[PDB]
Amino acid sequence: TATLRPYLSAVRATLQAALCLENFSSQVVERHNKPEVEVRSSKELLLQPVTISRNEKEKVLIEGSINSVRVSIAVKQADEIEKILCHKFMRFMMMRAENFFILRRKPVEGYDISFLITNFHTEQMYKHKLVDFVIHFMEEIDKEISEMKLSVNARARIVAEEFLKNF
């Protein structure tokens, strides 16, 4: 229902506030340094989860912490065919998480993809370009799925021709 420009702008202003990360050695093991949003072992270092959604199916969850932020987002699988094609697209993107330094190797339960930014990423990478990548993903994902649906339809038609024409 709601248009795409307000939804992205609300997400951007939220995510811009959550990337105020810091370096923070953990309290629970001698001198381990680990993202509190994933280890969750002390709870005065976790921020209140916040959620932005444009309808009942497309929602972005932001889970902050003193040293990390986890961003997990869901996209509308409007067709039976899109569920398959979206799962495969996410799988093949998630299969390369060592190159997308901010990407988890598994999604958060009930979300299609989920990013994890550490303080180190906001120190080494351009922080504002990490936001722009999350936004650029969120803009393009459904155009990319639509292209796959068309390209599969095309293949099915050409393969049907190559059988029938021989009779």
């Binding site: 506030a17 105020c20 050695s25 309290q27 001198r31 002390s42 005065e44 120190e123």
Partner: protein, 314 residues
């Protein structure tokens, strides 16, 4: 903006020599580099490399010319310039988790280390062993201690913490120091008594500072808020919330003005008036320090940040 990029990587602490001819920095590793102002351009003059893990705080005692360092290796070391090369002295710090901050006392007889072990170690020299020994402040600190500042009487110590609360503690070490005079914070001040507690409950407390009279503490919190507790109003605390990102460090520059800095990457001035007891955003990264004129009447102050490099302001 005077500026110089020592490193691309986060300058994780800095401390200044007595006459500001030299600056000590962490280049985002377990070594401390000292640079001398070789005319217009900085040149590295020493590399203190005894730590076994990342240094998290540096301080430089201006009268005694000694450098104290602490780190996530749970070490602290006091560095003395033996002839030409800096040599370390052991600190028996006795903490089971990372150190996070260090500050020399104004009289340079003692220093304090804040840590992840939910304690403040107060260190003083034990000359029969030629090592430094600790007493621990402990009881009300519920989480890690992020920043420290000393009252000018070298007894009262203000501490910020992840359990959202600024506090003032009496670090009176009876072994090394004559009993302090009474203060507006209180007349009692045996070791580890709790003089003050913040009203706050939400954000972590990143930075804490005393006025040069010691009658005021200000702190800054992850709420993007500044507060100032004034002892002459009997510890009434001003508050100002702001529209920008959080503030990471703060200093007084006069009894009635602050400078602060934060994730917005630029310094911000907050003035205060003793009449109404309100802070005001006079407006305009990782820590701030005063170069000249001190906390009473600063003429220059400087900043360093995760974005790298050093910057000087007037």
């Amino acid at each position: 903006m005077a500026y110089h990029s020592f490193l691309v990587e986060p300058i994780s602490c800095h401390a200044w020599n007595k006459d500001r001819t030299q600056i000590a920095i962490c280049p985002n590793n377990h070594e401390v580099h000292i640079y001398e102002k070789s005319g217009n351009k900085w040149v590295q003059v020493h590399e203190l490399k005894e730590h076994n893990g990342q240094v998290t705080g540096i301080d430089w005692a201006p009268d005694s010319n000694r450098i104290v360092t602490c780190g996530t290796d749970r070490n602290a070391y006091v560095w003395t310039l033996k002839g030409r090369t800096w040599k370390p002295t052991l600190v028996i710090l006795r903490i089971n988790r990372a150190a996070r901050c260090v500050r020399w006392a104004p009289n340079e007889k003692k220093f304090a280390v804040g840590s992840g072990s939910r304690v403040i170690s107060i260190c003083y020299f034990e000359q029969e062993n030629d090592w430094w020994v600790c007493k621990h402040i402990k009881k009300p600190i519920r989480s890690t201690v992020l920043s420290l500042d000393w009252h000018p009487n070298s007894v009262l110590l203000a501490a910020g913490s992840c359990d959202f609360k600024c506090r003032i503690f009496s670090a009176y070490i009876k072994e090394v120091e004559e009993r302090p005079a009474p203060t507006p914070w209180g007349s009692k001040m045996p070791f580890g008594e709790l003089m003050f507690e913040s009203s706050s409950s939400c954000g972590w407390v990143h930075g804490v500072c005393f006025s040069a009279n010691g009658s005021r503490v200000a702190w800054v919190s992850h709420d993007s808020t500044v507060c100032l507790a004034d002892a002459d109003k009997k510890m009434a605390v001003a508050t100002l919330a702001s529209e920008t990102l959080p503030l990471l460090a703060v200093t007084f520059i006069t009894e009635s003005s602050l400078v602060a800095a934060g994730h917005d990457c630029f310094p911000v001035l907050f003035t205060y008036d003793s009449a109404a007891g309100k802070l005001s955003f006079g407006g305009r990264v990782s820590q701030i320090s005063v170069l000249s004129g001190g906390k009473a009447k600063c003429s220059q102050f400087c900043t360093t940040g995760m974005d790298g490099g050093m910057s000087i302001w007037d």
